[PDB]
Design a protein around this ligand. Structure first.
Ligand SMILES: [Mg+2]
Ligand SMILES: [Zn+2]
Lengths: 148, 180
């Protein structure tokens, strides 16, 4: 039904893309429904190398436990495959609550660029919570402009 | 332009989902153009991994890889990871310009985790971005439930070459039915 089709939107900032040496600097989270309407906003936490990593994982895991069913909803965001690699390593209990599938907005951007080049030319941050809001609007823009 | 807009399709079969322990046992590669037209079939290799790792696999892994004939073909293989990487890197360099084409497939971020660790030179030839057919699958389920039911059931056994052809068939299905 509608609940199993909710999305767990995230945005993360790291020191780099090397999973062995880089760390999660900032993170934000929010839930939407299947039609991208924001149901709830999670926290916007800056992590030390302000709060520690293990506490952010508790904060974020609490937030999604009260908003989504266990192991059902996918992680959503722009280049969220880069974010999932770091969440699978540094927040494994948070990732245990989600599905293995992602709703990656940059996959949709790559298809828009190839298949709908005019729409792509006119396709549309200080916090990680603002970067999520921008990705939702980008995903909503593709739904209206390139999907049937 | 057109050569930079080609897609690098990949399917892996591993001994499990543990990046710290598990290894790659099968790999297939295929190239399509921007519009998902079939351009070229790449290698389809079964990579040799120890008997300890195969006997200590998950109950799902032992049963699915056993029935498919993969665990038997892995024990008989003479292909190392280094040998397969070289064959896969060679093939994509003949097909695509460096660092411009994405990796494509179903939840291909999991295949990228294993390729980033075990075939880093093959990943250096591809762009940063991926084409995850499972993102489009999730949006189809949600926004196009009728079309989603009409999509064909994944009929392939976990053989890299058969799996990669079905991910292409699945993205083509979405392009044909849920895109403008
Ligand atoms: Mg696979
Ligand atoms: Zn498979």
């Amino acid at each position: 039904g509608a609940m199993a089709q909710r999305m767990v939107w995230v945005d993360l900032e790291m020191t780099g893309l090397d999973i062995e040496k880089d760390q999660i600097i900032e993170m934000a989270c929010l839930i939407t429904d299947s039609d991208l309407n924001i149901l709830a906003e999670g926290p916007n936490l800056i992590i030390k190398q302000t709060i520690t990593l293990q506490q952010a994982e508790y904060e974020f895991l609490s937030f999604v436990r009260q908003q989504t069913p266990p192991g059902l909803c996918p992680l959503a965001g722009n280049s969220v495959h880069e974010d999932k690699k770091f969440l699978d390593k540094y927040m494994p209990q948070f990732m245990k609550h989600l599905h293995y599938r992602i709703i990656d907005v940059s996959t949709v951007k790559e298809l828009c660029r190839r298949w709908y080049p005019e729409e792509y030319e006119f396709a549309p941050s200080h916090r990680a919570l603002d970067a999520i809001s921008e990705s939702i609007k980008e995903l909503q823009f593709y739904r209206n402009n390139i999907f049937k």
